[PDB]
A paper describes a structure:
Oligomers of the β-amyloid peptide (Aβ) contribute to neurodegeneration in Alzheimer’s disease and are promising targets for therapies against Alzheimer’s disease. β-hairpins have emerged as important structural motifs in Aβ oligomers and have also been identified as a component of Aβ fibrils (77–86). β-hairpins are the simplest antiparallel β-sheet, comprising two hydrogen-bonded β-strands connected by a loop. 2AT is composed of β-hairpin peptides that mimic an Aβ17–36 β-hairpin, while KLT is composed of β-hairpin peptides that mimic an Aβ16–36 β-hairpin.
We have now designed and synthesized the covalently stabilized triangular trimer KLT, which mimics a triangular trimer formed by KLM. To stabilize KLM into a triangular trimer and thus create KLT, we mutated A30 and L34 to cysteine to create KLMCC and then oxidized KLMCC in aqueous DMSO to introduce disulfide cross-links. The X-ray crystallographic phases for KLT were determined by first synthesizing a variant of KLT with a para-iodo group on F19 (KLTI) and using SAD phasing to determine the structure of KLTI and then using the structure of KLTI as a search model in molecular replacement. This approach succeeded in determining the phases for KLT because the crystal structure of KLTI has the same space group and unit cell dimensions as the crystal structure of KLT.
Author numbering:
A (entry chain E), B (entry chain F), C (entry chain B), D (entry chain F), E (entry chain E), F (entry chain D), ...: 1 to 16
The structure:
Amino acid sequence: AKLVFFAEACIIGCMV
Amino acid sequence: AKLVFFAEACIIGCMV
Amino acid sequence: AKLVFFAEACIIGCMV
Amino acid sequence: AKLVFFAEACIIGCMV
Amino acid sequence: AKLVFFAEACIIGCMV
Amino acid sequence: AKLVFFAEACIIGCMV
Amino acid sequence: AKLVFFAEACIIGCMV
Amino acid sequence: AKLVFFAEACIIGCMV
Amino acid sequence: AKLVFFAEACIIGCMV
Amino acid sequence: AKLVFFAEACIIGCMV
Amino acid sequence: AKLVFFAEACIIGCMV
Amino acid sequence: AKLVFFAEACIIGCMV
């Protein structure tokens, strides 16, 4: 898997 | 734009 | 305190 | 949105 | 001074 | 190239 | 509060 | 769980 | 050992 | 190689 | 000592 | 110059 940083703008990293 | 580290506790970054 | 990086996934730092 | 780490060398992050 | 992250969107930290 | 935070759980950034 | 990377050169993040 | 930075030296963050 | 982020506040990562 | 963080100011990581 | 980021590629920070 | 991560232990990045 990959650690992905999204941000709806606040940012958060999530493991996918 | 800037990246703010709102940590209001936890820390999240967002721009302005 | 400490700065825990909870991985509940998603990583968030929080002061504990 | 995502944060990409274009490192094309140096590293810079940008969203999509 | 402060280390400030701006991003014209690619991000870069700079000491101000 | 792009730099992805790999995962499989430890995380490493690598070049691609 | 906000978390700023202080500087004066070393950098530290602190709560405000 | 939380992210642990092991020191094997070298530093690897792992989800524990 | 582990790298632990103390909130001595200001964030400082130290070994233990 | 190594990952130098040049502070020419502004911080950029580059593979050297 | 110093924390040096090796590009062993993948980025790994190690002590020296 | 470049950012050096001193290990005094604890880790402080300083502009050198």
